[PDB]
């Protein structure tokens, strides 16, 4: 209910390592195929934990 929010910017993201990290029980993507993430440039991202 009090879900935290975080903003990240001004860096480069290596999604390959995170994807290869099998510790994630669920690794799902809606607007993107999990593989392609390592080849796009983005305005910014929001992470909620």
């Amino acid at each position: 209910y009090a879900w935290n929010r975080k903003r990240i910017s001004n860096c480069v993201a290596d999604y390959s390592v995170l994807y290869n990290s099998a510790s994630f029980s669920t690794f799902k993507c809606y607007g993107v195929s999990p593989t392609k993430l390592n080849d796009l440039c983005f305005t910014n991202v929001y992470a909620d934990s």
Partner: protein, 49 residues
């Protein structure tokens, strides 16, 4: 952005829309061709007479 099978859905949507629009345009072109051809036949008759 996406993986081929998922992309195919959007591909289908957009091709349906585009083909429908362009065939409609072609139909309008056909009608305009018919009317202009009638006009041209009348003009040729007027010329010759």
């Amino acid at each position: 952005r996406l993986d081929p099978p998922e992309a195919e859905v959007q591909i289908d949507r957009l091709i349906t829309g585009r083909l429908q629009s362009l065939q409609t345009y072609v139909t309008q072109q056909l009608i305009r061709a018919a009317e202009i051809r009638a006009s041209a036949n009348l003009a040729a008759t007027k010329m010759s007479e």
